[PDB]
Amino acid sequence: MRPEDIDAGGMETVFPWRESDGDGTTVESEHKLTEIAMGVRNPVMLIRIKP
Amino acid sequence: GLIKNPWKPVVPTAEGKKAVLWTSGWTPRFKGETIYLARATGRPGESPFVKMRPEDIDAGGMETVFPWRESDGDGTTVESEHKLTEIAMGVRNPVMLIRIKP
Amino acid sequence: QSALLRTGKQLFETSCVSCHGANLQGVPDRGPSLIGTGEAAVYFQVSTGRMPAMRGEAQAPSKPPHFDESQIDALGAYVQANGGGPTVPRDDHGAVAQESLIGGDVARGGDLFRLNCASCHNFTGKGGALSSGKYAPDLGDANPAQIYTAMLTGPQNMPKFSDRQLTPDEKRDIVAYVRESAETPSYGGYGLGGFGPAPEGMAMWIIGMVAAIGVAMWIGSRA
Amino acid sequence: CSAGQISQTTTQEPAVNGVNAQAGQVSLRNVHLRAPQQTDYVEPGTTVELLFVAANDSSNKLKSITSDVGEVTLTGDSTVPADGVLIVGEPDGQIAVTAEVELTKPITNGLLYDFTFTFEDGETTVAVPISAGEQPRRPVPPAGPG
Amino acid sequence: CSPPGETASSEPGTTPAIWTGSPSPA
Ligand SMILES: CCCCCCCCCCCCCCCC(=O)OC[C@H]1O[C@H](O[C@@H]2[C@H](O)[C@@H](O)[C@H](O)[C@@H](O[C@H]3O[C@H](CO)[C@@H](O)[C@H](O)[C@@H]3O)[C@@H]2OP(=O)(O)OC[C@@H](COC(=O)CCCCCCCC[C@H](C)CCCCCCCC)OC(=O)CCCCCCCCCCCCCCC)[C@@H](O)[C@@H](O)[C@@H]1O
Ligand SMILES: CCCCCCCCCCCCCCCC(=O)OC[C@H]1O[C@H](O[C@@H]2[C@H](O)[C@@H](O)[C@H](O)[C@@H](O[C@H]3O[C@H](CO)[C@@H](O)[C@H](O)[C@@H]3O)[C@@H]2OP(=O)(O)OC[C@@H](COC(=O)CCCCCCCC[C@H](C)CCCCCCCC)OC(=O)CCCCCCCCCCCCCCC)[C@@H](O)[C@@H](O)[C@@H]1O
Ligand SMILES: CC(C)=CCC/C(C)=C/CC/C(C)=C/CC/C(C)=C/CC/C(C)=C\CC/C(C)=C/CC/C(C)=C/CC/C(C)=C/CC/C(C)=C/CC1=C(C)C(=O)c2ccccc2C1=O
Ligand SMILES: CC(C)=CCC/C(C)=C/CC/C(C)=C/CC/C(C)=C\CC/C(C)=C/CC/C(C)=C/CC/C(C)=C/CC/C(C)=C/CC/C(C)=C/CC1=C(C)C(=O)c2ccccc2C1=O
Ligand SMILES: CCCCCCCCCCCCCCCC(=O)O[C@H](COC(=O)CCCCCCC[C@@H](C)CCCCCCCCC)COP(=O)(O)O[C@H]1[C@H](O)[C@H](O)[C@@H](O)[C@@H](O)[C@@H]1O
Ligand code: HEC
Ligand code: HEC
Numbered sequence: 136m137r138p139e140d141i142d143a144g145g146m147e148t149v150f151p152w153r154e155s156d157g158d159g160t161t162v163e164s165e166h167k168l169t170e171i172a173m174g175v176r177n178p179v180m181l182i183r184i185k186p
Numbered sequence: 187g188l189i190k191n192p193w194k195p196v197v198p199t200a201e202g203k204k205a206v207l208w209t210s211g212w213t214p215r216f217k218g219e220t221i222y223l224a225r226a227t228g229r230p231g232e233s234p235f236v237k238m239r240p241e242d243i244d245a246g247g248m249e250t251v252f253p254w255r256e257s258d259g260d261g262t263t264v265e266s267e268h269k270l271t272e273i274a275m276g277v278r279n280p281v282m283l284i285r286i287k288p
Numbered sequence: 289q290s291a292l293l294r295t296g297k298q299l300f301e302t303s304c305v306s307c308h309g310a311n312l313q314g315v316p317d318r319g320p321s322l323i324g325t326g327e328a329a330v331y332f333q334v335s336t337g338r339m340p341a342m343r344g345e346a347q348a349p350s351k352p353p354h355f356d357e358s359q360i361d362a363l364g365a366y367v368q369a370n371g372g373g374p375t376v377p378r379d380d381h382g383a384v385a386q387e388s389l390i391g392g393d394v395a396r397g398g399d400l401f402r403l404n405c406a407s408c409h410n411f412t413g414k415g416g417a418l419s420s421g422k423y424a425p426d427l428g429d430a431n432p433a434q435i436y437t438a439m440l441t442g443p444q445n446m447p448k449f450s451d452r453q454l455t456p457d458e459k460r461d462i463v464a465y466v467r468e469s470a471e472t473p474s475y476g477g478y479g480l481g482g483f484g485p486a487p488e489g490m491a492m493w494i495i496g497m498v499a500a501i502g503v504a505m506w507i508g509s510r511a
Numbered sequence: 512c513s514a515g516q517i518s519q520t521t522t523q524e525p526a527v528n529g530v531n532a533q534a535g536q537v538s539l540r541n542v543h544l545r546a547p548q549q550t551d552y553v554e555p556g557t558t559v560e561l562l563f564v565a566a567n568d569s570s571n572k573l574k575s576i577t578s579d580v581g582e583v584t585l586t587g588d589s590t591v592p593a594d595g596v597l598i599v600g601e602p603d604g605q606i607a608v609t610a611e612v613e614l615t616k617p618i619t620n621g622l623l624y625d626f627t628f629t630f631e632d633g634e635t636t637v638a639v640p641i642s643a644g645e646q647p648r649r650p651v652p653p654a655g656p657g
Numbered sequence: 658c659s660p661p662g663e664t665a666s667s668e669p670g671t672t673p674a675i676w677t678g679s680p681s682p683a
Contacts, residue, residue: 160263162231218679226403227458229396237651240621241548241643242452246442246526249453250403259654266657288530288623288640311596313538313566314531317521323564324527324541326604344521346513371541371564372604372644373527421513442526452648551675622672 141183149179210278211253223283224254226274233260234270245287250280289365296366299359303340312370318344325441326373327364331384332437334360336430346421347444357384374440376433377456389432390464397461398469404454405439405462408446412469414482418445428470435463528642529563535633537572537591540564542626543642544618545600552617555581559618561610561626561639562600567591573631580624581613603644 141147156167171177195203200214212221224235235254243249252273261270273279301310307319314321319341333339337351355363368375379385391397408416413427422445427435436459442448454462480487513519525531529541542563546553553559561576561583570593576583587608591597599608618624620641627636 162262162264162267165264216679216682218677220676220678233654239649240619242450242648244448244450244453244528244642245640246448247450247453248447256654257657259657263656269657287524287526288638309566310568310594311566313540313564313596314525319521320523320525321527321531321538321540322525324529324602325525341520344514344518346519348520368604369606370598371527372602374645375604420519422519444523448526451645452643455648 141181143183143185145183147181149181150177211273211276212279212281220256222254222256223251223281225249225251230261230270235259235273243283243285245285248282248284251283252276252279252281292362292365293369296359296362296364299355299363300366303354307341312367322367323371324373325367325371326375327368328374328376328437329441329443330364330367331360331376332434332441332443334363336434338443347423350425374437376437384433386432389436389460390467391457391460391462392464393461394465394468396458397463397465400454400458400462401465404449410482412482413466427466430466432463432467435466436460528640530637530639532635532637534628534635535630536567537630537633538566539628539635539637540566541602542637542639543600543602544612544624544639545602545644546614546618546620546641547643547646548620552619553614555615555617557614559612559614560600561612562602564599565591565597569593575629576610576626577629578612578624578626579616580618581615583626584611584613585609586611602642603646 136147136149150171152171156164156171159165159168192207193205195205197204197206197209197213198215199209200216200219204213214221222237225238226234227236228234235252235258237254238249238251254273258266258269258273261267307315308322309315309319312322330339334355335353337353338348340354341348353360364376377385377389379388402411405413408418408424409427410416415426416424418424424446430438438446439449439454439459439462440451449459480491527541529543531538531540532542533539540563542561545560545562546557565574572591574585574589574597576585585608587599589597589608597608599610618641620643623638623640625636625638627634
């Protein structure tokens, strides 16, 4: 995702993603993506503040 | 709640829906379908079923073979990972192939 | 070697000619022909002591070997020169390969053994009974070369696995599994043979119940 | 009980990938065809090889092979000594008589094809198989996801 | 009793034809 995606006054939930695990098509990638969605300290809120 | 009709058509074949006990993995799903005799060679992550030739088994040998279609294969993805498991866990799937001395 | 072929022939006419023929063509109703068997068959049958056989029963047993390594090689080379066939794998020094036959992957060897070999032999390589007077022996005595050559040729009612059916890489894993499952100690106490419910039941009846009844008889009274 | 007239051990055939048919005072052993295959058939026009060993026990005999899958051609002495044998084919593993076949009709491994072996005194039909020796497993192209 | 439909024959039988295979699901 890009900085231009969020409007001023919006909020999004974001997760940590590496290049090494994308496209959970294979079984190993599905396991890796399941791991980063069930992390108890993973989710982050991204906020854009009005100028 | 635990009473079920066993003679209920649930299995799709080349002749419509049929009961479980009349079918197996070798039943054609459409007319002219090619079912290969595959063998278990490698690890689950290394294409567990591969094709075979008449030249591989010699006189006085025996091999275990399974029904394998071109529509499954490798098991690299998650879609073909649950299709290669149903083949190996089928109740009526395994076949013994023997070669008789001339 | 020319000098090794002739020393292997003089060993044959004194031990083998009675049941296999002068031309290796087989004596009817005493023994089969030896054309096309190779030196792998000879190695397996002579090293383990099965040959020469002593009578005709349901199955020829194993026993102490009659010849040594040099004589075994001579006999093998003499047989190989009369039709070809499989050969025993060697090492870099021209000796029989033992250490080089052990594979890396024991898990793949294990599940190959469980599918191909555990039916006749046991889970871990113990005995198993066959039709009428026949059986599959224990695998706890054979060196890697013997294990390799057993499934390359097909000794008896045991099938043969060609190099195309089981490639000479899966065979190494199988032999590794067989060799490892024989030298690993039991966890949790004495193995009790490694057969399962039958030795366990007998041990129960002959130890636990005997001790319990003895203790009861000690505590209690008679008449 | 297992050591009577009928014995389970004395009747065992050798595992050799070949036939052990007899003829007139001649025993033929390890009779097979060499034809390295690439597809479902071995097309006509290709030449293939016939291999066997002929043994007799006591002073000479001539021989000639005929078949129906093309024509068989012999090259060599093609006679048997008293206490010796005649080796024609050298199967892979051995460290000169040769039998070649023109193969008018296509052949495939798994089936049996009739060959007639005729001597100066005896003649038999054999119905030989095809055997591959020390040839390794041929590569199979990998599959996809499906 | 003996199972009906389990009988030996004396018919020669022919060698199977080469498999062609209809291309796609009908
Ligand atoms: C309330 C009390 C309850 C508790 C009681 C328990 C007491 C018993 C044991 C004591 C506990 C010790 C704990 C430490 C365990 C340990 O450290 O672990 C050692 C290893 O030990 C075995 O390794 C042997 C080698 O060391 C290995 O090198 C080798 O590889 C391996 O070989 C296997 O594997 C191969 C594959 O390669 C195969 O080829 C091969 O065949 C085999 O399978 C070997 O095994 P194995 O032969 O079992 O040893 C045999 C045992 C033999 O046990 C026994 O006494 C038998 C116990 C059970 C008896 C019950 C049977 C009942 C029968 C009925 C009577 C039948 C008849 C009645 C019915 C009909 C009635 C009507 C007539 O001792 C011997 O050696 C010789 C005998 C000496 C032992 C004597 C001690 C106790 C005896 C009791 C009486 C004393 C009198 C004097 C005696 C001298 C394997 O287990 C290994 O896993 C294991 O790792
Ligand atoms: C105890 C004292 C009392 C006295 C009575 C008995 C004493 C001795 C008499 C026994 C007879 C001689 C036996 C030796 C001969 C022998 O060695 O045999 C030949 C060969 O034979 C096998 O092949 C058959 C051919 O040779 C092959 O050509 C052929 O092909 C093959 O055919 C099969 O195989 C083929 C594929 O090859 C298939 O094509 C084919 O279809 C088929 O399947 C053959 O085999 P098959 O027919 O199975 O058997 C047939 C053999 C099999 O041997 C046998 O004697 C069988 C052995 C069992 C003996 C009977 C035991 C009796 C029980 C006790 C008396 C009870 C105890 C009570 C205690 C007292 C209590 C006190 C109060 O002939 C017989 O039955 C012989 C008949 C004689 C038996 C008579 C006894 C019954 C009468 C009752 C008397 C009661 C007394 C008191 C009452 C008051 C071969 O392979 C080899 O092994 C073997 O070499
Ligand atoms: C299938 C069936 C119906 C069973 C009966 C079959 C049958 C005919 C039985 C014969 C068994 C025998 C003993 C065979 C040998 C020949 C023989 C001597 C015959 C009879 C001799 C005779 C008539 C007179 C002698 C007098 C006499 C009292 C003899 C003693 C014989 C005895 C007591 C032997 C034991 C018998 C027997 C069947 C025992 C079973 C025990 C079992 C099942 C245990 C299995 C077992 C095993 C296999 C282990 O590996 C093991 C390893 C480490 C610890 C424990 C065990 C263990 O318990
Ligand atoms: C006493 C009785 C059975 C009542 C009769 C009632 C009756 C007539 C009703 C009809 C029922 C019918 C039709 C009968 C058939 C019975 C049947 C098919 C099974 C039903 C189950 C059942 C009733 C089981 C009870 C069996 C029973 C009472 C056994 C007692 C054994 C006793 C008293 C022995 C103790 C002495 C002792 C410590 C012995 C030393 C050790 C030995 C050698 C014991 C024998 C022994 C045993 C018992 C094993 O099971 C065993 C299993 C695996 C390996 C070895 C052994 C073994 O050695
Ligand atoms: C004293 C104890 C027993 C007392 C017996 C007194 C009678 C009481 C039982 C009567 C209950 C009848 C229920 C009627 C419903 C009905 O009509 O069932 C149909 C088929 O009708 C029929 O032919 C009826 C035939 C009844 C005879 C068969 C019973 C005799 C045998 C089977 C013994 C049964 C005991 C079971 C043992 C239990 C194991 C634990 C010990 C098939 O339905 P089905 O296509 O499977 O669709 C549904 C799914 O969708 C849904 O998931 C679910 O699986 C079902 O609801 C299913 O019905
Ligand atoms: C008569 C008894 C003998 C003698 C003196 C020898 N052999 Fe052995 N042999 C015999 C039989 C009946 C059988 C077949 C059944 C079984 O295998 O027990 C065999 C088998 C062999 C084999 C296996 C061949 C195969 O794979 O087809 C070999 C390699 C073999 N025998 C070798 C051999 C040698 C080198 C002998 C001289 C020391 C010898 N046998 C003696 C019966 C008999
Ligand atoms: C049933 C038939 C089988 C199967 C499927 C396998 N084996 Fe085993 N085997 C069997 C018999 C009846 C015999 C005895 C033959 C003889 O004594 O002539 C054997 C022998 C062996 C041996 C040699 C014996 C030894 O010295 O301990 C080995 C090493 C062996 N068998 C191993 C083995 C393996 C690795 C198998 C699967 C890959 C296998 N066998 C299959 C019976 C049968």
